[PDB]
Amino acid sequence: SMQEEDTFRELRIFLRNVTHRLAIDKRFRVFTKPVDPDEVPDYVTVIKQPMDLSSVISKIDLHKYLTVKDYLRDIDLICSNALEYNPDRDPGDRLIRHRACALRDTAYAIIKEELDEDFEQLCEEIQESR
Ligand SMILES: Cc1cn([C@@H]2O[C@H](CO)[C@@H](O)[C@H]2O)c(=O)[nH]c1=O
């Protein structure tokens, strides 16, 4: 449907806007790009599904997200990866875990305030019909 395509285009605009606001926050810099393999060579072995905000933008533009739920699974992945890969009591690990939790919480709070539930419901229904 042309009307369904308008729905998804609006979803994409909304997701780019949320992702931009996360990406510009200084606390979340570490999550804006894939990690440096030369810097952290065991990362690809420990973390099988790397995710970051640049990859999220790429996925939005590739029409990979048809719902906000599918977007949040990738935000959740950014966060869970950070908790799994940096689990220690040392301050560097604690800092990154705090920042990961904050990224997750911030994304969910923006969505809570700014996503219309009926718009998400529409997206989910279109997705489930395909
Ligand atoms: C996302 C992430 C990053 N880092 C460090 O910050 C650099 C830039 O991402 C990485 O190369 C790594 O040294 C980590 O140590 N753990 C992580 O989970």
Burial 35-52 (b: 16+ CB within 10 A, else e): beeeeeeeeeeebeeebb
User: Residue type at 34?
Assistant: P
Q: What is the total residue count of the chain?
A: 130
User: Residue type at 87?
Assistant: P
User: Residue type at 78?
Assistant: I
19 touches 75 (CB < 8 A): no
3-state secondary structure of 67: coil
Q: How many domains is the chain built from?
A: 1
Residue with structure tokens 């019909």? 129
- Written as six digits, the tokens of 24 are 């510009």
Upper half-sphere CA count for residue 75 (Cβ side, 13 Å): 27
> 2 CB contacts (<8 Å, ≥6 apart)?
none
Q: How many CB atoms lie within 10 A of CB 61?
A: 12
Nearest CA to ligand 1 atom 11: 36
Q: Which of 30, 55, 88 to mutate to test the pocket of ligand 1 (most atoms within 8 A of CB)?
A: 30
Method of determination? X-ray
Resolution in angstroms, to 1 decimal, for this deposition?
A: 1.8
Rounded Cα gap, residues 112 and 123, in angstroms: 16
User: Residue type at 50?
Assistant: P
- Residues spanned by the domain of 29: 1-130
Q: What is 106-130 written as a DSSP string?
A: HHHHHHHHH--HHHHHHHHHHHHH-
Domain CATH number, residue 1: 1.20.920.10
Pocket of ligand 1 (CB under 6 A): 30, 35-36, 39-40, 82, 85-86, 96
User: Residue type at 46?
Assistant: V
User: Residue type at 103?
Assistant: L
Note every long-range contact of 84-91, with CB atoms under 8 Å and residues 24 or more positions apart, other chains counting.
84/46, 84/47, 85/43, 85/46, 85/47
Nearest CA to ligand 1 atom 6: 30
Q: Is 67 left (phi over 0), alpha (psi -120 to 50) or beta?
A: beta
Rounded Cα gap, residues 126 and 129, in angstroms: 5
